[PDB]
């Protein structure tokens with residue numbers, strides 16, 4: 001099943017689209033999780049919002065200017081907090097001559113331009129805006145309420161973690177980047193591209209994630225010494241040519257307006273925006289995640305980074321291991337190829 005761990009694309013019917021959790025289980029039955037990233041194109045008739053012109057009374061509280069330093073396919077991205085702005089201000093900069101999408105023919109050309117120009121003309125990214133663009137009425141794949149076991153954090157312990165159990169909006173322009181990372185606690189993510197230009201993604205299969213970590217640690221021994229999981233800083237950019245040179249297996253895919261991307265536990269990904277767009281994002285879980293959460297290597301160097309108590313998950317969903325786990329004896333080795341238990345119905 002998917003032996004090259006390539007990114008798969010799915011086209012559910014409206015009937016299939018109703019049960020979020022079941023559909024994640026299904027795409028894992030087909031091997032999607034091996035890639036680390038999958039694309040889901042929703043039914044033609046489904047839309048999460050009637051229109052998107054009413055936008056600008058929405059504030060971007062903390063836009064970030066992305067300064068990139070490096071050379072030879074290896075970069076560090078510094079995020080500089082700017083003053084709050086409207087979508088309107090963002091769009092104007094996005095579409096200005098200095099700071100709009102270059103003319104290009106094929107993706108491959110736009111990609112070359114990205115990697116050639118990523119240290120020049122620092123763009124602004126309207127990242128991490130708390131809020132949703134779904135209407136209250138929309139029940140299918142509603143990023144504001146996906147109803148997975150992740151809900152145990154909010155319902156059992158009361159804690160809300162912005163962008164993790166709540167929706168974030170991202171306003172992109174040309175050449176805004178997301179650095180190589182897995183999700184907080186090695187969770188799943190869902191990303192819906194509401195409108196605008198594409199977002200391009202790179203992915204490294206979870207079964208090869210340790211190999212990328214080794215590579216990263218090799219290139220930045222400074223950061224390795226100061227932090228157990230420096231990639232969680234979301235500052236490290238590494239080009240596909242670099243990955244290819246060091247034999248890291250990876251895939252690429254472009255997400256267009258109206259498509260969902262799913263990332264899987266321990267799926268390293270990175271990418272960039274083609275132009276003005278808006279994405280909405282959140283984290284979520286399945287039972288398979290539990291072991292990943294238990295085994296996640298967290299940032300040890302800056303505090304108020306995202307940590308979830310695994311206790312409630314182990315007790316409830318792995319009752320046979322709860323004791324072994326509490327006394328630190330567990331020792332389960334994760335098999336990255338195994339689909340989530342809920343997929344049994346389809347296997």
Ligand code: NI
Pocket residue numbers: 181182183189263269
């Ligand atoms: Ni991510």
Ligand SMILES: [Zn+2]
Pocket residue numbers: 226227228229230233299300301302
């Ligand atoms: Zn750290």
